[model samples]
Target: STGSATTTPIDSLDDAYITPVQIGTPAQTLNLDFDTGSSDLWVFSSETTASEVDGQTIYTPSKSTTAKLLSGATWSISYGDGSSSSGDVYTDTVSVGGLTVTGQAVESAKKVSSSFTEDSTIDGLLGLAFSTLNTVSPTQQKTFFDNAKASLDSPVFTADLGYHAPGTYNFGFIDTTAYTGSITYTAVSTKQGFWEWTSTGYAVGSGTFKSTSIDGIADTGTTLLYLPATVVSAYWAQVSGAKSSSSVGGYVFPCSATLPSFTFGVGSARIVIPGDYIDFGPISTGSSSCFGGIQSSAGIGINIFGDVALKAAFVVFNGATTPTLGFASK
Candidate 1:
């Protein structure tokens, strides 16, 4: 039998999508961020320092009859956004939706960066990237999907991320009914442990789609779309009050500015990111300026088709000889 799970958005524009996962025998339910950009299944747990725990729900291994500590195994990870977490390893029965895998490596965090500690709603992260990228020392760990794929009817998963709405993460099966139009498949190179692909080109507003080969990654963990600096400048150029604001962080524009749509060419398929999506949110809680969802991938060499862009399409992550990325309109 196949399995699927619903992902809930934590905030507006849905910065992060989290799914409920059960760990251990008694099943300690945790809301984990389904991160496609990383490769470690880590959680806030009893091992986490009390000061770092804050409002996060901790996983108590002692209460779980099936939890086993992996001697000498440990993991630590840092994200592009500078968030980090480090922890010891534990093997436990883990289940997502209806898919269950015994002796799944579950990293229990002992220390976490302030960023993760501040965002208390997220109890952990469920990494879907290649298992080769797993950070565990001594030996690497396999993702939940990796261990369960052999039993799946079709080794595939589809991400249906919505805008300020509830979405679903379907594993081992693809629900065609969840997406519209045909799925345009593109070849993916996972040598970098990412769903990386080269987009044919992109256009600002009603401008023509230029034939520029842009290499980037499809990341659900990231909040905004990141492109080359030149592209970001061109997109913001059309806005009257838009400017790069270091003070506000990234590019900020008048909240009432007229924003234009951004479109990307994926092979023969065209995906349009709505203008409304460009205005991510206010620069601050009560600020009159808003941050543009598209930014410059200056420090990070690769562009990121993050949540802002993915929300505009239905995505298929296929595990094949040459991994494929299938995109369709929702």
Candidate 2:
């Protein structure tokens, strides 16, 4: 509700808007999500040839008011989904939500894949996800968050990142109203290198989620919450009053009525899923109500609490406090 930011994934180019802070300066711009899930800041470069990438916002350092490249420490990242990019490191003063951090870390993609080189509007990404999930390793240098921690008003920076309508993507405040129950801290396990977690129990309204327990690692890198087929089909069946059909490779029901108030049990934290999450915009042969909330992935490993689920509650990812999830209503 305080600051506004947005990002869309390109076919080959994955982009999300982020607040960019220069290593030592407060001046900042809303950066794309090229590096949000990672620990670096990557903006598309003008030097990139069209053949190398597609469908992303290209950054012209010459065009930025305060953009400077670093002489040492460059890097690259590849996701488990197989998307990857390589670039040089640089420094710039960046600010988000009126707060500024000086000498912030940023990356410039000199050689993007053919998929990234094609994007015209979106230029880059700002990675604000967990450090372990970072595309760039520790050797590349500290994450943007690590660099900004000293100046951060709170030790943690929270992303109330949401999707569709009533966009409520706020940064850097403790909004605890989004969740219920006491906060639980789970040790991070390296499940294929993703900071994975498991919760003892979670309930939606009054009882346990009878739906399949689709537990997973919360991922800021993804947009839609990927669920198991059993859970997705069961959820649509319960909400729509009828068995839902598959479209856009996910469930789709008529955008006929207000969506039910759904909540997720993340340990003790009950993260609620708002109503609009049901009427996600159309992506079908017919103009059907897009199931903005859930996508079915058979062997996708962990469930990702994408923008669909995160925006509804206040979440705290505090590394200092033993990786506990604090939930609240906004």
Candidate 3:
């Protein structure tokens, strides 16, 4: 079923920055960002120090027999968190789940920024978020999927959240059979660094929140969902005493209860979000307010549906060939 013709906007959130599937025999994992904002698949090598990098899962070239480094080409990326990394270029045969692609280009970051050093372990990010935002090829370059598509049994691929944890990520050929029904899609509009969208809207909760309208680009590059002040207030109203104080931002609620799950109202259909996902984590805040997915970003003009919201669904990005966006059941 072609679900909703009206699609939500995606930006290069950088949140997808931490979910790259690790490749190689005996197979290791790397949290390379699936960023559309760039096109380079990079990771940290043995040459890097564990303490220097930021919040990421790092991969060491020395651990793999297939790892190869590229000479002359160097890479460095900066994020909203004020972190950066610079390193050499390399190519290797990488694997994602059961799928393996040969001759994939990768970067080896040596020096990383301090902001990144505090957030998490590892180094570097994977840029699958897009072609135009690619850090590797200025004109044209084959992305991980671009190079492996022909080898994949299915034309599409998907990410599955077996469960959230310290380390648990899976990727492979899209399971066409897993789709309980038909799929819906929307067209992507191209622009620069700005996140744009098509004036479509979505329904949150079990019909409690009103269907909110939106207009912007959909980016795999970004990590959090940005909602309007009104929408944020509306969603928070469902929770008792959900308030914003200090640097806690918007839509703060008590963490103990099972929050209601919401659906994205795209066209005539809706995509569901887990109620538990609304609660950021069991971790407490302000000794009272629990974290919720919907937050406030005062300076961000365009609303971003970041990873916190996207993590619950299956998304098919078509930057490999066209500007088409597909959504389906996980």
Candidate 4:
């Protein structure tokens, strides 16, 4: 049967949005971060050290009759932000919203870095990237969406990421009521296991759009916007009192600096981010200096349109043949 699900954001130390997912026979619910940048469905579980568990909820497969061990299979993953987790595997029924996938591969975490254990609220991560990126050893695993797509009327999902507010993730269907205007579609190149696309150009303030191409990924997992170092410098230069501080690691400006809007071109449409949003927030509490929300993607190789950018639009992740991305004014 064709089915769909909707998820709302939960409490996160960072800007991440968490969704609830059920696993096993007598389903145990876990709050997971829906990450589009990586491919692996892993959770804090009984396998994890008790001391490391902190206040995060753990998934207990032993309590579920349907959980079956995938003998000898293991997974280890390290994120760009330096967070890491590793564990063994099991096959069980996994459900999200109104959809379910029987015998889905679920990785149970045995070890997690402080980056994860400290978050306490994030129980796991639900990967929405290409299955090819799955970290399971010997054999890769498919995501819940990949296995559930065959029965869906259309293979598509939408990410509505809100800033300091609740947002929704809609699967198998796009809710017309969620966005206004038209959804502009762009062909995606997934060779990198990411929603990578090229922008026609960009602009600083209300300046003319330059014809400089930007190759980047639309990553819901990443928290900020990143561009080439040169481009980042140019944008910050236009802001009064903005400077690239080695100690700060990126560009920082006076908290009261008057900033200009930054715009990026996609197809014939331009997505403009307000100047105030660029000020991100203070580098630290009680600090007068503020860090820029947009930074250089130089050493990282690929530019990223993270939450700061995605929150400005309604994003559609179409997984049917030749995966495409659609964006619209929210």
Error of 3 at 278 (Å): 0.7
Cα lDDT of model 2 by residue, 1-330, tens digit: 122233333332122334333222323243455333455567666665556756554555665556676676667877645666777766666555555555666667777765445445445656655555544433455555656565555656565554433223344455465445544454544444343555443333333565334556556666666766666665565564434454355566665655665577655555667666545555544665545466666666666666666666555656453444445555
Q: Could you tell me the lDDT of residue 145 within candidate 3?
A: 65
Rank by lDDT (best first)? 1, 4, 3, 2
- Clashes (candidate 4): 0
lDDT of each: 0.89, 0.54, 0.56, 0.85
Worst 10-residue lDDT window, candidate 4? 5-14
Best-fitting candidate, measured by TM-score? 1
Provide the TM-score for each candidate, comma-separated.
0.98, 0.72, 0.75, 0.94
| Superior candidate under lDDT, 3 versus 4 | 4
Tell me the deviation in Å of residue 279 in model 1: 1.5
Candidate 4 residue lDDT tens string, 187-278: 89999998888887889998888887898999888878899998898899898788988898889999888888888888998888777667
Candidate 2 lDDT at 222 equals 65
What's the distance in Å from true for residue 5, model 3? 29
Best by lDDT: 1
Q: Clashes in model 1: which pairs?
A: none
lDDT of 1 by residue, 58-137 (tens): 88999999999999999999998888999999999998889888999999999999998998789999998889889999
- Order of all candidates by TM-score, from best down to worst? 1, 4, 3, 2
Return whichever of 1 and 3 wins on lDDT: 1
Model 4 residue 169 CA deviation (Å) reads: 0.6
